[PDB]
Amino acid sequence: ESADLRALAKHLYDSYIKSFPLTKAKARAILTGKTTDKSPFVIYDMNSLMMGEDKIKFKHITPEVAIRIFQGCQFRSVEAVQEITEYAKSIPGFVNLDLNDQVTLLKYGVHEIIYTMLASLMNKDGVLISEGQGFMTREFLKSLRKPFGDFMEPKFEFAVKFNALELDDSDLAIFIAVIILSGDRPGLLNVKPIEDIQDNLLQALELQLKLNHPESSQLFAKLLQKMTDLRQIVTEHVQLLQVIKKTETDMSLHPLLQEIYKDLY
Amino acid sequence: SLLKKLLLAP
Numbered sequence: 001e002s003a004d005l006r007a008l009a010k011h012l013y014d015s016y017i018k019s020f021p022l023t024k025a026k027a028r029a030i031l032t033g034k035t036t037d038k039s040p041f042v043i044y045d046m047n048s049l050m051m052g053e054d055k056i057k058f059k060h061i062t063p064e065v066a067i068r069i070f071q072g073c074q075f076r077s078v079e080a081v082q083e084i085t086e087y088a089k090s091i092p093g094f095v096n097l098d099l100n101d102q103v104t105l106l107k108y109g110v111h112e113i114i115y116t117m118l119a120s121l122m123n124k125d126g127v128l129i130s131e132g133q134g135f136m137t138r139e140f141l142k143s144l145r146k147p148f149g150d151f152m153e154p155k156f157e158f159a160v161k162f163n164a165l166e167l168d169d170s171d172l173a174i175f176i177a178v179i180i181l182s183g184d185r186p187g188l189l190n191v192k193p194i195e196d197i198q199d200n201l202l203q204a205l206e207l208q209l210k211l212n213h214p215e216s217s218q219l220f221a222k223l224l225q226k227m228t229d230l231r232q233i234v235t236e237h238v239q240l241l242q243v244i245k246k247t248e249t250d251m252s253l254h255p256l257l258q259e260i261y262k263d264l265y
Numbered sequence: 266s267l268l269k270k271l272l273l274a275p
């Protein structure tokens with residue numbers, strides 16, 4: 001039933017709102033300057049990065065600059081993996097999958113979801129950090145010494161094009177769900193049940209886009225290509241990651257990320 | 266694995 005597909009769409013959106021603290025809706029309001037909330041602290045150079053040390057709060061307690069920024073992205077990614085795991089568990093059928101298949105879906109899925117959702121926090125000028133407490137300029141991130149100055153440009157470039165599609169949180173909830181339920185991730189044991197779930201999610205997405213974006217017939221086909229594109233973004237990221245792990249004297253990589261990156265491309 | 270633990274937690 002189409003009605004059931006709308007109910008599924010709504011369930012995913014409600015779960016999405018529960019699982020992810022900063023939504024695109026709120027992020028756009030902040031970025032444009034509509035919210036009654038206090039303005040994000042702007043980090044545009046080294047000096048303002050230092051000043052931001054006091055103002056911006058991080059959930060994790062931690063009693064050179066390029067490295068600290070990279071480690072900061074690391075920890076945000078750790079938080080994001082946990083948020084995304086919570087969301088995946090709300091997708092009907094997911095928790096009933098073989099547990100090792102659940103692990104596999106997350107392992108290969110999370111970074112693609114991280115960068116999808118990171119777009120919501122980005123414009124052409126910079127990215128929101130720490131739930132909107134801070135805004136780091138795209139230019140400052142680019143100015144970082146190599147290899148780090150190029151760490152995030154691929155993502156800003158993806159985000160600028162992706163945001164031009166003008167999806168909202170209701171679109172994104174289903175888009176994310178489809179990506180997570182990918183039946184072609186390496187090493188999946190029981191493919192059919194994942195394919196069947198994704199097939200229904202894809203039907204939900206198609207109907208969502210037809211109703212929510214009536215004038216843009218091409219949107220569904222474009223989003224399917226963005227899913228393929230996201231795999232390339234993650235590939236590039238993993239490769240720059242190996243460059244960093246070497247071209248720098250070894251730094252600490254979070255064990256959750258180590259686990260994900262093992263056998264990741 | 267750590268991912269498995271996150272998945273199992275209610």
Ligand SMILES: Cc1ccc(Oc2ccc3nc(COc4cccc(C(=O)O)c4)n(C)c3c2F)c(C)n1
Pocket residue numbers: 043049052053056068069070071072073074076077114118127128129130134136151152155
């Ligand atoms: C005061 C202050 C502010 C910021 C800061 O470093 C940080 C701390 C958190 C951050 N969160 C983001 C968002 O961008 C991301 C998030 C997740 C993954 C990726 C990615 O490319 O993989 C990018 N950036 C850039 C951060 C950053 F740069 C530190 C260490 N101190």
